[PDB]
Design a protein around this ligand. Structure first.
Ligand code: SF4
Length: 85
DNA sequence: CCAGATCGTGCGACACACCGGGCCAATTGGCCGATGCCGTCCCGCGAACCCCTCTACCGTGTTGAGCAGCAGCGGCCT
């Protein structure tokens, strides 16, 4: 349908700062990614599943070692066990 | 002519609509409490850092043009 022939051939920016700009969650409620009280961690996991820079997000999160929120489709203890493994 | 598409109607299934129950998984996220390394500070000494002081064969010198005010002088006036 309205796919623009996979981004088409009309582009003038020819400039990218980094993989932040390709983040899908930026098009989405930030609050849902930090479940307070008990919360849930599956809808935002589904959102991350379709992210095109999931690997980069996971790598950056692990390298900087944030212990809050859900990054790369994984929550805190998945990151912790991956770090410990 | 007359037979399937369309639709009427019917029976069933049925994917949930409800609105209410009764428990549970995941997943907590706090810092609880205990343990440990770094920032700040107070000397301790020493290198340097800046200021002050003194040395007595003796030695004695660095263009043109325009406009205006002041000093010297010739010459009355008394
Ligand atoms: S993987 Fe990272 S960048 Fe992508 S949507 Fe999830 S949190 Fe955002």
């Amino acid at each position: 349908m309205t796919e623009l022939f996979q981004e088409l051939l009309v582009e003038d920016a020819d400039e990218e700062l980094g993989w932040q700009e390709r983040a899908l969650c930026a098009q989405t409620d930030p609050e849902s990614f930090f479940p307070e009280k008990g919360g849930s961690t599956r809808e935002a996991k589904k959102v991350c599943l379709a992210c095109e820079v999931r690997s980069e997000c996971l790598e950056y999160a692990l390298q900087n070692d944030e212990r809050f929120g859900i990054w790369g489709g994984l929550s805190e203890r998945e990151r912790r066990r991956l770090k410990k493994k």
